[PDB]
Ligand binder design. Structure first.
Ligand SMILES: O=c1ccn([C@@H]2O[C@H](COP(=O)(O)OP(=O)(O)OP(=O)(O)O)[C@@H](O)[C@H]2O)c(=O)[nH]1
Lengths: 30, 254, 140, 161, 65, 124, 123
């Protein structure tokens, strides 16, 4: 609570991985 | 020279390996030749069992709303070399892992695989010596242990291998809802127009006394277990013959 | 070749202790082997054996946490190598304090380090731990 | 990843007659006598079948109403339209009778009455009766009495004919 | 009859009947039928040491029912 | 240090896979421990991943070549060892450059598989 | 005659045990028949019972050597072949002298095992 008071390349890999995982899951569904 | 004889010793070992494996093929072929009879005499015992339990339900609503132990009874072979049957069953069980999952696998390979894989969920397993024929008593032993593992269980599932043909062994599922949920569905199939095919069957059970219904439920549950183990054995011997041939040819190429 | 029996529990840890990159001082090597021999590393995971050895040699948990009651036997006293080499570790002069130091080091290590190590799930923390343990192989 | 249900591979389903339908005059009962997932008879047209349920004996002929019967250790008779009688003996199970003209008798064990031996049956009754005398507790006595009931039924079944 | 009062389940009742029925079969034919009523099953959990701990929750033999 | 640690881990994985390959050929891949199946799958992916289409062999390979920077070689392999790419198909690592190329190839394979599944389903 | 007969029986059993060892690697120890496993269990004891600590290799082994008399060796092996010591633990025959030393080592093995059981029991 007291923490609240006072206080990109890798993203592309994560984005691609999420998309691939989504596609592999979608094909399973139907 | 030692180097030359090193190869000779290496090839000497492969020769005995071929003989022993060929001996395995002889054993399995005899068991498969005598287990081929069930193919003639199957597909008729479980007719009203279908009405009792055949419910093509969705695969999500069944497991999502689990408020009580879901017991699974995968069928696995005692000895290895069967093929991918055990591996697929594990994949089929891993795909249904949940908080309420309890496992009572059958066979040493199932126990060994699941004791390591799922130590906490695994309670204990059943082992049968492949000395006598798969009989009713063995199925009754599977069911009694399953109830004692989780009497307040939402469902008891059996995951086994169906022997479609000599080269086709699919994975089949018998889902058995406990008494409370079954009699509730049996009550709706009787009164309501829904579940027409089960209307006459359900009303013919509600007329009788309860103990008879409970005996009916247990009896048909045992039959489903008996069919699964019987099929899982026939798929096992058929698969081993296929696998053993592969090992023979691999040991011939070497 | 053919079950967590004592020989199999300690055998793996001895093998892990045999990985080295630089020659080890006699005092440090003998002490570590004695510890693994008398079961002081049974509760320590195999992956963390090198980290345990590094703290034992290049650190002193008892002094860090103020629980060290030994009079002379400390791993930072390099002159003890020749006393060990004369009397043996299983001698009344050195045996009593040796066991006390190992007992304190094991208890402190398990409590303050292994518990946190087994509680790491963050990818950043996991990677940091992996670097630490590999470095400990090449340090002690 | 959906798995087939084990009943999908079975191609002989049960046909139920819609209640709002015309009646048919049937002269044959399609019997399916089964033991331990093995059919001794399959959709066999018969004249009649006699079964012993807990309440008593039922003589099932074509067109019998829908009913479920809990069998007891006893003989089971099948009479064909030709005029031939085949007698089995069952140790238990269930009999499902459908108004469409079918009867599926699933038994744990179904053995032709010829196979059974009266001499073996008789001496077993004597031994079990002695066992009942030495039965330790109430549970043991109940189990022994289960055996005697089956044995006496077998003995009486064979003495009948 | 009286076995229900003692907690014996229906399935155990059938196993006892089947064994008794197989008992009465002729000695020539007993071999075939008796292979269907011979207990050969156990329930085992792998012990901590790597052994087999037999679970005694369900009986295996009709005598011990 | 990261480069050294990754390289040693790769070598250890490939060393173990070689030893397991002896058992695999004789008996079969399905007679192994479930732990040793994971190692096999990771090792096979590593073997495929080590392949690379060269820019001087655009005729014999039929594909455009790649230049992989050392910092992507280390990161791609380090992630693969951790197991974050276990869902990716094995063939996605074959004849590609960095991890990004692996993911793009996996995406195309997934799209083709989805199209085939759609065609099969529509056939019903 | 006893010496000749005992030696031949030992050699035959060792030969057979090696053939079985090929089976035990392909099929496994479970598949072996009752007779075969008895050969396996007896033969393994013979293999370990042939070992002996020498009086000159004390530094290598760390244990005192033994001098086994000819008669003691024949009698000890004769009893082992016919199963007189089937219940003795296998390791009791490892690096020992005559039969007497085997029994003493087995007793020591039993005592230490009991102590371990007691320690486990207290836990
Ligand atoms: O007090 C009662 C009343 C009824 N019942 C039971 O309810 C059921 C009603 O059965 P039905 O009414 O459907 O037919 P039924 O009388 O012809 O039955 P059977 O004797 O031919 O089998 C029968 O199985 C009867 O035994 C009891 O057990 N106790």
């Amino acid at each position: 609570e007291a923490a609240e008071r006072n206080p990109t390349g890798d993203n592309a890999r994560d984005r691609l991985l999420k998309e691939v995982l989504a596609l592999q899951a979608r094909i399973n569904q139907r | 020279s030692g180097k030359l004889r090193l190869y000779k010793e290496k090839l000497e070992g492969y020769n005995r390996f071929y003989s022993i494996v060929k001996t395995i093929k002889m054993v399995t072929l005899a068991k498969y030749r005598a287990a081929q009879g069930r193919i003639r005499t199957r597909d008729f015992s479980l007719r009203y069992t279908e009405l009792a339990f055949s419910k093509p339900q969705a695969s999500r609503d069944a497991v999502v709303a689990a408020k009580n132990a879901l017991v699974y009874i995968p069928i696995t072979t005692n000895r290895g070399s069967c093929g991918a049957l055990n591996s697929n069953i594990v994949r089929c069980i891993d795909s249904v892992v949940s908080s309420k999952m309890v496992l009572m696998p059958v066979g040493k390979r199932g126990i060994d695989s699941f004791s390591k894989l799922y130590p906490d969920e695994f309670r204990y397993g059943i082992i049968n010596d492949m000395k006598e024929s798969m009989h009713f008593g063995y199925a009754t032993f599977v069911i009694e242990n399953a109830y004692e593992v989780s009497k307040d269980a939402d469902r008891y599932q059996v995951i086994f291998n169906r022997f479609v043909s000599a080269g086709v062994q699919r994975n089949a599922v018998y889902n058995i809802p406990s008494y409370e949920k079954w009699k509730e569905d049996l009550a709706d199939a009787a009164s309501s127009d829904n579940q027409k095919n089960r209307y006459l069957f359900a009303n013919a059970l509600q007329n009788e006394e309860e103990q008879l219904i409970r005996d009916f439920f247990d009896f048909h549950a045992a039959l489903a277990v008996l069919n699964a183990v019987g099929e899982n054995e026939l798929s096992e011997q058929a698969a081993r013959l296929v696998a053993v041939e592969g090992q023979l040819t691999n040991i011939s190429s070497l | 070749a053919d079950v967590q029996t004592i020989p199999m529990i300690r055998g793996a840890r001895f093998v892990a202790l045999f990985n080295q990159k630089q020659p080890s001082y006699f005092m440090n090597a003998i002490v570590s082997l004695y510890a693994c021999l008398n079961g002081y590393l049974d509760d320590v995971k195999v992956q963390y054996v090198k980290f345990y050895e590094y703290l034992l040699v290049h650190r002193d948990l008892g002094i860090m946490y103020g629980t060290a009651k030994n009079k002379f036997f400390y791993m930072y006293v390099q002159e003890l190598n020749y006393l060990i080499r004369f009397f043996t570790l299983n001698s009344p002069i050195l045996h009593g304090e040796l066991e006390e130091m190992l007992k304190q080091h094991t208890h402190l290590f398990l409590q303050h380090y292994q518990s946190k190590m087994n509680a790491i799930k963050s990818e950043k923390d996991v990677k940091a731990l992996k670097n630490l343990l590999y470095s400990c192989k090449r340090a002690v | 990843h959906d798995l087939p249900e084990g009943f999908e591979f079975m191609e002989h389903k049960v046909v139920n007659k819609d209640i709002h339908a015309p009646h048919e005059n049937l002269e044959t009962l399609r019997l399916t006598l089964t033991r331990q997932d093995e059919f001794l008879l399959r959709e066999e047209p018969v004249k009649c079948v006699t079964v012993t349920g807990t309440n008593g004996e039922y003589g099932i002929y074509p067109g019998h109403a829908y009913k479920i019967v809990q069998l007891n250790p006893s003989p089971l008779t099948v009479e064909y339209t030709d005029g031939t009688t085949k007698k089995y003996f069952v140790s238990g199970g269930f009999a499902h009778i459908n108004n469409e003209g079918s009867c599926d008798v699933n038994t744990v064990e179904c053995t032709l009455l010829d196979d059974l031996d009266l001499a073996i049956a008789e001496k077993e009754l004597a031994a079990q009766q002695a066992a009942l005398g030495s039965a330790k507790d109430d549970k043991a006595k109940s189990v022994v009495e289960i055996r005697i009931s089956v044995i006496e039924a077998v003995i009486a079944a064979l003495k009948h004919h | 009859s009286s076995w229900r009062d003692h907690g014996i389940s229906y399935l155990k009742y059938l196993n006892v009947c089947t064994e008794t029925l197989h008992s009465t079969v002729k000695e020539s034919r007993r071999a075939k039928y008796e292979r269907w009523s011979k207990p050969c099953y156990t329930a085992q959990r792998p012990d901590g040491a790597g052994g087999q701990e037999t679970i005694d929750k369900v009986p295996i033999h009709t005598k011990d029912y | 240090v990261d480069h050294y640690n990754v390289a040693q881990d790769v070598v250890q994985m490939l060393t173990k896979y070689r030893e397991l390959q002896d058992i695999i050929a004789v008996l079969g891949i399905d007679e192994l421990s479930e732990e040793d199946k994971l190692i096999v799958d990771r090792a096979r992916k590593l073997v495929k991943f080590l392949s690379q289409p060269f820019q001087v062999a655009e005729v014999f390979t039929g594909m455009t070549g790649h230049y992989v920077q050392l910092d992507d070689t280390i990161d791609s392999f380090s992630g693969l060892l951790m197991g974050t790419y276990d869902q990716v198909p094995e063939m996605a690592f074959y004849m590609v450059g960095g991890i990004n190329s692996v993911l793009e190839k996996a995406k195309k394979m997934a799209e083709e598989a989805a199209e085939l599944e759609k065609m099969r389903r529509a056939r019903v």
